[PDB]
């Protein structure tokens, strides 16, 4: 990407409400406010953000070729599975990093964050760049393999520390069906189904769309607050986790942008559309994943993966990855 861009975009986007509200809640939390956005208000912000994202996902699916979406969906899946394996051959193998810890931290970094995706969509709009309106609906095709792969490559490493310790079965369907029932992803699945079959244009332009950026600023405040709380969790686990939490989201994005960029060539996929894939990739599960991984990989230490994903994974894919991969797609615009 252009340095003259990623700098412009960054100091620009750092002054936008979306990012200004992330680092904003990061510093009132750092000054120890007794401020608390109620738990009830942050689950309805997620519902709004995700029905809205899903209503247009579904409304623009009822025109699209379902050939145009073919390649981005398969790349959407292959990243989710790959990212877990990268955490397996490049962090699990370091000292004081229990593999079953890194495999869960890879399953959160493979999994998606809607609030980071949402922060990236209202940036692309805000910056007059356009993207497939079904690009949002890539999100679940990554959120679920990544979680699954982490759970299944975990409950394999432990079935290999079993068969080795003696010489001297994981149900996948239920977890990708549990993943599909999560509130966030269900909010999407409902908005998607509504805009394919019903005609929710009325309530979208009068409710779900007007409030998207306003409730996102709150959610972005929330997510930079809950990003600071989890920082104490990182001292308790290794310090390799801090290096991964920093550089993994800039690596995971490029691998996506590279793959993404196989369709400013192959099937026409937009430069906005690959920015959405790259930013989906870099994001770190935050809310949905940590329960799904507490459950399928229980020996995993939630300081390792909940502290990596929420304290550094999210503030970097919002603060640094959005203005970097908007800036890369933007340099691909010579003359």
């Amino acid at each position: 990407d252009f340095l003259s861009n990623f700098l412009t975009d960054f100091v620009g986007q750092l002054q936008s409400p979306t990012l200004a509200f992330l680092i904003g809640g990061m510093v009132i939390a750092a000054l120890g406010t007794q401020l608390v956005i109620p738990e009830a208000i942050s689950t309805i912000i997620v519902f709004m953000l995700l029905t809205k994202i899903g209503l247009t996902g579904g409304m623009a699916i009822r025109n699209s070729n379902l050939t145009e979406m073919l390649l981005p969906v398969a790349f959407s899946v292959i990243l989710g599975i790959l990212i877990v394996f990268i955490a397996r051959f490049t962090l699990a193998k370091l000292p004081n990093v229990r593999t079953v810890d890194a495999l869960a931290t890879g399953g959160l970094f493979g999994a998606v964050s809607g609030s980071t995706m949402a922060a990236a969509l209202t940036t692309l709009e805000e910056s007059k760049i356009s993207y497939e309106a079904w690009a949002g609906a890539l999100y679940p095709f990554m959120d679920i393999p990544a979680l699954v792969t982490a759970i299944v490559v975990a409950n394999i490493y432990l079935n290999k520390r079993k068969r080795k310790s003696a010489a001297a079965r994981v149900k996948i369907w239920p977890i990708i069906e549990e993943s599909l029932q999560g509130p966030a992803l269900s909010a999407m699945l409902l908005g998607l189904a509504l805009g394919i079959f019903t005609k929710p244009e009325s309530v979208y332009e009068g409710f779900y769309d007007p409030l998207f950026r306003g409730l996102l600023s709150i959610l972005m405040l929330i997510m930079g607050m809950e990003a600071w709380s989890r920082i104490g969790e990182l001292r308790k686990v290794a310090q390799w986790y801090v290096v991964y939490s920093l550089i993994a989201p800039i690596v995971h994005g490029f691998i996506a942008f590279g793959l993404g960029m196989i369709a400013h060539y192959a099937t026409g996929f937009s430069l906005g559309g690959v920015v959405v894939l790259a930013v989906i990739a870099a994001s770190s599960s935050d809310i949905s994943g940590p329960p799904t991984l507490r459950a399928g990989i229980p020996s995993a230490n939630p300081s390792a993966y909940i502290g990596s994903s929420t304290a550094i994974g999210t503030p970097i894919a919002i603060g640094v990855c959005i203005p970097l991969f908007i800036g890369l797609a933007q340099t691909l615009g010579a003359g």
């Binding site: 329960p291 507490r294 459950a295 229980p298 020996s299």
Partner: protein, 93 residues
């Protein structure tokens, strides 16, 4: 006015349905879940058992299946039931 055991399971939020189903199977009458939190956020079951073998058997199952990787403390009080149809005399008592 018959006696019974108050088995208390205060453990992690995740387990709610997985422990609620272990209790439902034990032969326990009913239970009461609270939302709680603490250090050492949380959950708390209060289960009243006729036998003490049941209050233990419930505490044994939740600790065999979940307590090597999820946190939580199971303690038993010893109370004394005055009323409740599905427990003390079905009437009066």
């Amino acid at each position: 006015a018959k006696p019974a055991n108050k088995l208390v399971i205060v453990t992690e939020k995740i387990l709610l349905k997985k422990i609620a189903k272990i209790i439902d199977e034990s032969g326990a009458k009913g239970y009461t879940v609270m939302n709680t939190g603490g250090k050492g956020a949380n959950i708390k079951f209060e289960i009243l058992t006729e036998t003490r073998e049941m209050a233990e058997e419930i505490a044994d199952r939740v600790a065999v299946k979940y307590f090597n990787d999820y946190a939580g403390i199971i303690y038993i009080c010893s109370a004394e039931v005055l009323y409740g149809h599905t427990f003390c005399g079905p009437e009066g008592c």
